[PDB]
Amino acid sequence: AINVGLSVSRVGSAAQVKALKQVAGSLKLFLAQYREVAAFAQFGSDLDASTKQTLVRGERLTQLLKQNQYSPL
Amino acid sequence: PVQTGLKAVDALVPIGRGQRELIIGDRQTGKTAVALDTILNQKRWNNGSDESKKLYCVYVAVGQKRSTVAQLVQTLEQHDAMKYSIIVAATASEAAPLQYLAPFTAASIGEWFRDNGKHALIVYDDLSKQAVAYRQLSLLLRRPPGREAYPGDVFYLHSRLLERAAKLSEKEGSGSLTALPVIETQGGDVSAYIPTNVISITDGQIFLEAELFYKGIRPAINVGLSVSRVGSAAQVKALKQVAGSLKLFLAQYREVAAFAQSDLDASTKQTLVRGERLTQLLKQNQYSPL
Amino acid sequence: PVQTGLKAVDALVPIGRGQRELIIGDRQTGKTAVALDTILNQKRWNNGSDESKKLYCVYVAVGQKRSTVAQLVQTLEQHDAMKYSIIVAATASEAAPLQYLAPFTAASIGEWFRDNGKHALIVYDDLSKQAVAYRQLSLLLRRPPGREAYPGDVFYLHSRLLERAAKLSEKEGSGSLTALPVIETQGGDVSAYIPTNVISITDGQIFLEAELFYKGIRPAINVGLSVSRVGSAAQVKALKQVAGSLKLFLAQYREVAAFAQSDLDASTKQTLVRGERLTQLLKQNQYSPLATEEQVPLIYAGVNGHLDGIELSRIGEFESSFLSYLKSNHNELLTEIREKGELSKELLASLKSATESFVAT
Amino acid sequence: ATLKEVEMRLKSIKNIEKITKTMKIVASTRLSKAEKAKISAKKMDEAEQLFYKNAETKNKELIVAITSDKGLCGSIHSQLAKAVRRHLNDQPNADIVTIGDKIKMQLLRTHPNNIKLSINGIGKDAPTFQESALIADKLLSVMKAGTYPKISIFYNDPVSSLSFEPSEKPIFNAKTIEQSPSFGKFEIDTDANVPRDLFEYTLANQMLTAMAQGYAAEISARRNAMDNASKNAGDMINRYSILYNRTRQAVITNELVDIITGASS
Amino acid sequence: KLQFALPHETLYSEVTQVNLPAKSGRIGVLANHVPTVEQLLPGVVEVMEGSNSKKFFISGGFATVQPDSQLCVTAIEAPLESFSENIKNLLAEAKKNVSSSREAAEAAIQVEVLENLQSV
Amino acid sequence: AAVVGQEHYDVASKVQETLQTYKSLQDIIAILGMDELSEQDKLTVERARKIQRFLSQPFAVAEVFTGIPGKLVRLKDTVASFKAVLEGKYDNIPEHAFYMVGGIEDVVAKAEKLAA
Amino acid sequence: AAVVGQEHYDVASKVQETLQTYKSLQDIIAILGMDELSEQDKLTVERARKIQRFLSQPFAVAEVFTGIPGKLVRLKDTVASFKAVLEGKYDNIPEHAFYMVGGIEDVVAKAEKLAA
Amino acid sequence: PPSFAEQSTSAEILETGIKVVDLLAPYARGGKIGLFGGAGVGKTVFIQELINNIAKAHGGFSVFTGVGERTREGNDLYREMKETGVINLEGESKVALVFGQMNEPPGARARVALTGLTIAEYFRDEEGQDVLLFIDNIFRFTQAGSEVSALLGRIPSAVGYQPTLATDMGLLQERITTTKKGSVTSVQAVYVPADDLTDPAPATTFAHLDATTVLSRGISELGIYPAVDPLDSKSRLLD
Amino acid sequence: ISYAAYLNVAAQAIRSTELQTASVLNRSQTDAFYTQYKNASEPTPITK
């Protein structure tokens, strides 16, 4: 279980696989929007479709991130 | 049993002989008064010639103004209770070694009764002021500040003090020095080092209800946070049978009165009606014990 | 009174001569600028022959680099005020004994003025670095460092220094040594040992705050959290008269700013109208002192709610125009405010008419 | 730290306190207008009811429900949801018109099919004839309301100024009007198609009133709730304050220990 | 008795002579008038309580003398004078508007209202 | 994993997630209400309050002290019990029934007792 | 003031005020949302958001950090561009059309790119 | 401090002319009733009123002892006290003044209190007269003691406060009591450290104070002089 | 034309000279949408 908001890699995508650089390009942005929206959502404010696009996409991403002990890939 | 004369401290926080069980709560909420009431009730067997149920009670006043002690004594002499009791004193003015040595010396007297196989009782008000005293000496010995700057060998002090209270075997003459150590929470803080050390050593606490205290009642007791364990096997059977888990019932009331900001089923309402009325029944004024 | 040429300081936080009052706030928000403004309005007073009006100011620059202090010196000279000024300099690199004794020695200079019956103002900026220097000394002298590793008898030092500031009696000649210690905070942590001590010693506080800075009040003061404990006894009678009202309107404005952000009762909304205009009027930019004869009119307008009509953006335009209009209509009236020093009912009657006329055009 | 994170959380609670404070007061202001409308409306409604009572008007089925788009009006949404659901056990096949987003969502959970018509834009203003008229006109066309000899509408009646009980009334159809016994003691004419007009007219007149009662409860609930919030926040303020104070003391102790350590070594 | 009310007012919610324009032409009610149910058309109404007379322009509604002799008048919005010159100009345009544009029927009602206004 | 059963591990995992959500929303729920959070969340919360109460199991050596006779629940029983609760099967019977009692069967029986 | 140009100062005073309000409004939007937010407040939110991404500017260094070469914007151009935004001459312009742009030409250019 | 015998065995209510004081926070004989609510409630004037009342009440005197005095405030007090005739130069002066400025060294700051107390005990014991001894900040009493402890080399106890805090206060507040002769009584000013009552210096102070009279500025703003807020003022002497 | 529409138009017309205050305009000038539903299903929200 990783808290990726306080995780950094200051060497950028030069240490990342080229294929993976391309694919995960907006992964950070989506997640950043998910985190913000999710926080807002808990103050129970009514949500427009633009926020709920993020939220709905975001939930799928959250499940995608999850790792189970002792599984490489 | 130790008959405190309070239903709540004899069946909602039941006790008997030998027990160690602190009384914890907010500073000078008539803290002394809670303990005093127990001493006053014990006049039925303390003015009784039944020596087993007669206690020889020591009231240890540490860090207490000599004026306040003199008012207490006069109060005791009005209730003619002074005669069956000893007072040990180590006033606020009185020196830091004297305060430190006041409980240990007191326990020696207590042991003379105990080692005569007789039942006694000792109330140590306040060990927190003993911590402050021991702190002064240790720091002046350049010994390092313990947790909350109260020395680390304060732990040893209290642990030796506390365990010299206990009911003893047929060999030892069936004697007891029943403790009741009254711990003052500085700033109401109950996470403090000194209280927690006492809590772990003792069995049972007598946590007191501040909100209710503000809303009167000398005394108002937080029985939700008061506990006893081995005092509940030191009971008297009359008040064990009649006490049909009334603590539980009143912690069904505790739950019920927790939530209302909320629909109340007629059953919860009945519990609440009993509970509230029971709370009223609990109320008792100082210097008068049942 | 001592006049800074800043309407809010002179009225809301009325200051005198002899008095010691804090300036606790965050550095470089023109902490030095607030201080400098007073000296410049004191130029006016300096011109005034009496030497209780010639405030021979002393700026005590503690732990401040020579490059910055060079700018300060030049600024004082620019506004032609460096000729009754004294600048005691203990720079950032200058040694900790010099820093420690710099306010003390500086005070002794101040005693000479005070003794001569003259008045002067000593502004210690920042006594926090004086504290730090003492910490260096104490630790090196193995004398125990107090709370927050800052000596415990730093309190003792501050008390000795700050209680030499005094408005004397005619026994020792009525002269004075106004003081204005400046304490630098990094979060407004008054809890911190050095602030707690200084807060206790000083009479009054000025609490300068960041939120206001962002909101365009530069230099920025939160004057809700500024206080005076020497009060309006050191205030012009005239300026007191037309600025009691201002405090109350603003007081309501603070509370009613907490419902400002929609639908509001007329009373609340009214407060907001006067209050927003007033907030804009109380804005001030660095190194602009303003005469008492122009302080008195501006607050009167706001009090009479005459500012309400003139749009918020147009408050700026209103100010300069209003003042010139007052001078044209009756700089006789203005001269009366200055010379009488009191506001006659007839003069305020006329003034009210004048303001109405000015609001019209 | 401990100190700063405590402090920041305490500040969060503070801001919540400020917001709940602001809201409850503003709600009260709005509430005054809400009650005024409901009074005038209820007087008007009474004149209509005067006929129906004396007439002894006598009642698939339609269900209408009323809530605003907006939330933050306590348990208006869910007390109403429960009473709708009760009459959706009386006939689940009832065609539900949900006038309000909030009741739409809750009710959608219990049954989603039964939702037939719904309206967006309710919460923006106090009930008005214009709204009622358009909803009614559309209600008649789309849902063919007149066919159902049972219409019942649900709303929240604000029973006492601190309470609300979700309440209902039955909207009198043209069928009801026909079979009302006294209707001849009132001189009905064959020169007018009074059922075909009157049904429509009381569809709206009843609807507007039901809405006004609901609306009043809505703004009232918001005030009540926002007040209860402020109390709860105060208690959390106190709890974090004690923690804050303790954390200050501990920090002071640890700093002093450091000094002592330095001297000792 | 007699009630006259709006959901915003309570006009006369007693009144002695009432002149009403109803499905059946115009109807007048004075003291005991046998209980009626008449659908009120958009109307020019005169209400007299004593000899005092108040004149109302009414959106249409319903009229019902009760058996309580309470003439319940219910209408959405009325005084006569408030409805009334800019409206004449506007209505003249609205008459034009029927030419350009349910909308045909609506625009016709705007003209109908113009006739009702004209009657005043 | 399947060290002590994948299913066992799965049930425990779910208990943790539910509880973590439940603890998380304690601030908001208290300041406001549970109604000012979603219905889905309300089911989760209601389920979790039950789980919290269910976790009680009177002590069989402080049976004297508590007064209440103790309860000892088997590991085999435990997997079954929590599995049911996670599916909310017994989420319909009093939280008073759940409170201060052991086994799932005991909860059910106490529901009947309460009903009387 | 006029140390950096009077106009430059005024533009920058307006920018700071706009941002500061937006930060305060985050709390209002958090619970209340659009409630107790005027037309003015929505505009202030939008202007602040446009300004918010106007700060974002490419870096020459960015290859594997972004990959978008830096933008060097003339002094005159920067003064002009912030002025325009504030005046609302670029208030029909999306938030993202200030994202990673330089000068006035760039603000318009990235507006154009979104436009088409 | 006096023996058990010469300490209060039974406490009686020292009378005042203020009805509000005698009802809602009755002053005790030997007792310490620590004033709370600073000047702005007319604290100084309230204190002056008490001096007059004490003089009528028993025949008493007072001694205003000021610890950590701001030399400005000291000036104001002397001038006000002269004017209100509690010190009448030509006339009689009931109150004796001892002022201890903050500038005065920490050792002398600690000893101003004891000096004031000695005068008071001379009044009680050797002139019989009950006296009422005002103390200013006992926080600044604490601060002075704390500093001298660190100077003495003694390790600062919790929150920095001296290890001998209890005993020193103990002496000071047990030399204020009811002897056979008079009784000293002490009204003290408690400069709480940001209402962090939890801290030892306030906690210990409140431990010594029998009653607290909690004047409010709200109350005085409702035009009420006495400025006493009885829903804040609490006494154990209301029994 | 339907009677409730007939009255509605009439009310709107009545909202027309100088006496026509904002609250009158609001009582007969409000905008909304009717999000029709169906059996889950939902014919799209179109201005009411």
mmCIF file of all heavy atoms in Angstrom, chain B residues 66-72 74-75 92-94 132 135-136 139-140 148-149 186-187, chain H residues 4 7-10 154-155 157-158 163-164 166-168 170-171 173 197-199 203, unseen atoms left out:
data_model
loop_
_atom_site.group_PDB
_atom_site.id
_atom_site.type_symbol
_atom_site.label_atom_id
_atom_site.label_comp_id
_atom_site.label_asym_id
_atom_site.label_seq_id
_atom_site.Cartn_x
_atom_site.Cartn_y
_atom_site.Cartn_z
ATOM 1 N N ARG B 66 -1.971 23.279 55.504
ATOM 2 C CA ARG B 66 -2.148 22.892 56.879
ATOM 3 C C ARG B 66 -3.463 23.418 57.373
ATOM 4 O O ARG B 66 -4.152 22.728 58.113
ATOM 5 N N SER B 67 -3.904 24.574 56.817
ATOM 6 C CA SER B 67 -5.194 25.147 57.091
ATOM 7 C C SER B 67 -6.296 24.234 56.656
ATOM 8 O O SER B 67 -7.226 23.997 57.415
ATOM 9 N N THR B 68 -6.173 23.641 55.443
ATOM 10 C CA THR B 68 -7.207 22.813 54.872
ATOM 11 C C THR B 68 -7.355 21.554 55.671
ATOM 12 O O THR B 68 -8.465 21.116 55.958
ATOM 13 N N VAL B 69 -6.214 20.987 56.116
ATOM 14 C CA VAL B 69 -6.173 19.808 56.942
ATOM 15 C C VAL B 69 -6.873 20.032 58.260
ATOM 16 O O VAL B 69 -7.509 19.133 58.791
ATOM 17 N N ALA B 70 -6.702 21.227 58.855
ATOM 18 C CA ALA B 70 -7.330 21.607 60.091
ATOM 19 C C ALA B 70 -8.813 21.756 59.987
ATOM 20 O O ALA B 70 -9.528 21.479 60.944
ATOM 21 N N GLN B 71 -9.321 22.227 58.835
ATOM 22 C CA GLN B 71 -10.726 22.222 58.551
ATOM 23 C C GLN B 71 -11.255 20.829 58.419
ATOM 24 O O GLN B 71 -12.338 20.540 58.910
ATOM 25 N N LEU B 72 -10.481 19.919 57.782
ATOM 26 C CA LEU B 72 -10.865 18.539 57.605
ATOM 27 C C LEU B 72 -10.975 17.843 58.927
ATOM 28 O O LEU B 72 -11.939 17.136 59.177
ATOM 29 N N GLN B 74 -11.540 19.225 61.842
ATOM 30 C CA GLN B 74 -12.657 19.772 62.555
ATOM 31 C C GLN B 74 -13.916 19.173 62.018
ATOM 32 O O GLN B 74 -14.793 18.827 62.793
ATOM 33 N N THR B 75 -13.987 18.935 60.688
ATOM 34 C CA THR B 75 -15.088 18.252 60.049
ATOM 35 C C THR B 75 -15.209 16.859 60.601
ATOM 36 O O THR B 75 -16.296 16.448 60.982
ATOM 37 N N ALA B 92 1.771 21.104 52.103
ATOM 38 C CA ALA B 92 2.360 21.704 50.928
ATOM 39 C C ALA B 92 3.628 22.451 51.240
ATOM 40 O O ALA B 92 4.614 22.353 50.514
ATOM 41 N N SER B 93 3.630 23.195 52.368
ATOM 42 C CA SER B 93 4.796 23.851 52.886
ATOM 43 C C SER B 93 5.857 22.858 53.278
ATOM 44 O O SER B 93 7.026 23.083 52.979
ATOM 45 N N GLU B 94 5.459 21.702 53.882
ATOM 46 C CA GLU B 94 6.387 20.723 54.411
ATOM 47 C C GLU B 94 7.260 20.121 53.348
ATOM 48 O O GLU B 94 6.851 19.934 52.203
ATOM 49 N N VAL B 132 5.805 15.131 42.343
ATOM 50 C CA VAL B 132 6.384 16.450 42.307
ATOM 51 C C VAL B 132 7.491 16.587 43.323
ATOM 52 O O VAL B 132 8.503 17.230 43.059
ATOM 53 N N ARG B 135 10.499 14.445 42.356
ATOM 54 C CA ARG B 135 11.061 15.086 41.206
ATOM 55 C C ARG B 135 12.059 16.093 41.654
ATOM 56 O O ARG B 135 13.173 16.119 41.145
ATOM 57 N N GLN B 136 11.709 16.886 42.691
ATOM 58 C CA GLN B 136 12.538 17.953 43.168
ATOM 59 C C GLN B 136 13.852 17.426 43.640
ATOM 60 O O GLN B 136 14.891 17.917 43.225
ATOM 61 N N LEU B 139 16.130 15.776 40.664
ATOM 62 C CA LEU B 139 16.674 16.795 39.812
ATOM 63 C C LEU B 139 17.803 17.493 40.502
ATOM 64 O O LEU B 139 18.811 17.801 39.878
ATOM 65 N N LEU B 140 17.689 17.653 41.838
ATOM 66 C CA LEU B 140 18.693 18.277 42.655
ATOM 67 C C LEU B 140 19.815 17.316 42.919
ATOM 68 O O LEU B 140 20.883 17.730 43.355
ATOM 69 N N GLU B 148 7.570 12.942 31.630
ATOM 70 C CA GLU B 148 6.931 14.153 32.090
ATOM 71 C C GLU B 148 7.730 14.843 33.172
ATOM 72 O O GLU B 148 7.225 15.662 33.934
ATOM 73 N N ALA B 149 9.040 14.516 33.208
ATOM 74 C CA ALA B 149 10.055 14.984 34.107
ATOM 75 C C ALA B 149 9.866 14.451 35.485
ATOM 76 O O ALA B 149 10.557 14.869 36.406
ATOM 77 N N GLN B 186 -3.629 16.446 36.735
ATOM 78 C CA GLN B 186 -3.155 17.788 36.526
ATOM 79 C C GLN B 186 -3.669 18.180 35.175
ATOM 80 O O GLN B 186 -3.356 17.554 34.164
ATOM 81 N N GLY B 187 -4.561 19.189 35.161
ATOM 82 C CA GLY B 187 -5.169 19.690 33.962
ATOM 83 C C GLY B 187 -6.216 18.742 33.447
ATOM 84 O O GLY B 187 -6.619 18.845 32.292
ATOM 85 N N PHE H 4 -0.521 23.999 63.150
ATOM 86 C CA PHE H 4 -1.861 23.509 62.904
ATOM 87 C C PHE H 4 -2.912 24.288 63.664
ATOM 88 O O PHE H 4 -3.964 24.619 63.122
ATOM 89 N N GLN H 7 -3.573 27.777 62.370
ATOM 90 C CA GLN H 7 -4.039 27.700 61.013
ATOM 91 C C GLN H 7 -5.516 27.527 61.196
ATOM 92 O O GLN H 7 -5.975 27.146 62.272
ATOM 93 N N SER H 8 -6.290 27.850 60.136
ATOM 94 C CA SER H 8 -7.732 27.932 60.150
ATOM 95 C C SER H 8 -8.333 26.565 60.407
ATOM 96 O O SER H 8 -8.117 25.636 59.636
ATOM 97 N N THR H 9 -9.143 26.445 61.485
ATOM 98 C CA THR H 9 -9.686 25.184 61.950
ATOM 99 C C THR H 9 -11.137 25.183 61.538
ATOM 100 O O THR H 9 -11.719 24.143 61.234
ATOM 101 N N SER H 10 -11.678 26.401 61.361
ATOM 102 C CA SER H 10 -13.011 26.669 60.926
ATOM 103 C C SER H 10 -12.832 27.990 60.244
ATOM 104 O O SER H 10 -12.041 28.814 60.702
ATOM 105 N N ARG H 154 19.874 24.382 39.077
ATOM 106 C CA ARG H 154 18.854 23.397 39.310
ATOM 107 C C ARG H 154 18.156 23.149 38.013
ATOM 108 O O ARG H 154 17.888 24.095 37.273
ATOM 109 N N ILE H 155 17.889 21.856 37.709
ATOM 110 C CA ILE H 155 17.309 21.435 36.461
ATOM 111 C C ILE H 155 15.887 21.965 36.403
ATOM 112 O O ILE H 155 15.126 21.706 37.336
ATOM 113 N N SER H 157 12.031 21.943 35.851
ATOM 114 C CA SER H 157 11.055 20.876 35.833
ATOM 115 C C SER H 157 10.126 21.182 34.703
ATOM 116 O O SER H 157 10.446 22.020 33.871
ATOM 117 N N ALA H 158 9.027 20.406 34.569
ATOM 118 C CA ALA H 158 8.148 20.417 33.426
ATOM 119 C C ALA H 158 7.635 21.776 33.054
ATOM 120 O O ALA H 158 7.210 22.562 33.899
ATOM 121 N N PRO H 163 11.875 23.279 40.128
ATOM 122 C CA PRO H 163 11.570 22.037 40.825
ATOM 123 C C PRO H 163 11.030 22.300 42.202
ATOM 124 O O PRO H 163 10.551 21.363 42.833
ATOM 125 N N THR H 164 11.118 23.552 42.683
ATOM 126 C CA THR H 164 10.846 23.924 44.046
ATOM 127 C C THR H 164 9.615 24.783 43.979
ATOM 128 O O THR H 164 9.365 25.591 44.866
ATOM 129 N N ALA H 166 6.398 24.064 44.031
ATOM 130 C CA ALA H 166 5.351 23.735 44.946
ATOM 131 C C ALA H 166 5.652 24.219 46.324
ATOM 132 O O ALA H 166 4.787 24.791 46.970
ATOM 133 N N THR H 167 6.889 23.998 46.811
ATOM 134 C CA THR H 167 7.214 24.296 48.182
ATOM 135 C C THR H 167 7.236 25.778 48.446
ATOM 136 O O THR H 167 6.865 26.226 49.524
ATOM 137 N N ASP H 168 7.735 26.566 47.473
ATOM 138 C CA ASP H 168 7.820 28.001 47.580
ATOM 139 C C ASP H 168 6.490 28.663 47.608
ATOM 140 O O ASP H 168 6.275 29.617 48.347
ATOM 141 N N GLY H 170 3.910 27.011 48.501
ATOM 142 C CA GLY H 170 3.391 26.397 49.689
ATOM 143 C C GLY H 170 3.632 27.215 50.900
ATOM 144 O O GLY H 170 2.762 27.347 51.751
ATOM 145 N N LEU H 171 4.855 27.762 51.020
ATOM 146 C CA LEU H 171 5.221 28.662 52.075
ATOM 147 C C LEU H 171 4.472 29.950 51.985
ATOM 148 O O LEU H 171 4.043 30.494 52.998
ATOM 149 N N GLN H 173 1.616 30.646 50.486
ATOM 150 C CA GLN H 173 0.200 30.497 50.634
ATOM 151 C C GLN H 173 -0.132 29.684 51.845
ATOM 152 O O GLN H 173 -1.257 29.219 51.970
ATOM 153 N N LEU H 197 -4.005 26.167 31.244
ATOM 154 C CA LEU H 197 -4.254 25.874 32.632
ATOM 155 C C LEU H 197 -3.642 24.558 33.020
ATOM 156 O O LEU H 197 -3.266 24.337 34.171
ATOM 157 N N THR H 198 -3.507 23.677 31.998
ATOM 158 C CA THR H 198 -2.935 22.358 32.027
ATOM 159 C C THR H 198 -1.522 22.467 32.536
ATOM 160 O O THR H 198 -1.091 21.621 33.315
ATOM 161 N N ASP H 199 -0.801 23.558 32.153
ATOM 162 C CA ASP H 199 0.556 23.839 32.565
ATOM 163 C C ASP H 199 0.683 23.864 34.070
ATOM 164 O O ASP H 199 -0.312 24.086 34.760
ATOM 165 N N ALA H 203 -1.781 25.457 37.058
ATOM 166 C CA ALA H 203 -2.466 24.374 37.726
ATOM 167 C C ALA H 203 -2.235 24.418 39.209
ATOM 168 O O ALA H 203 -3.166 24.300 39.997
#
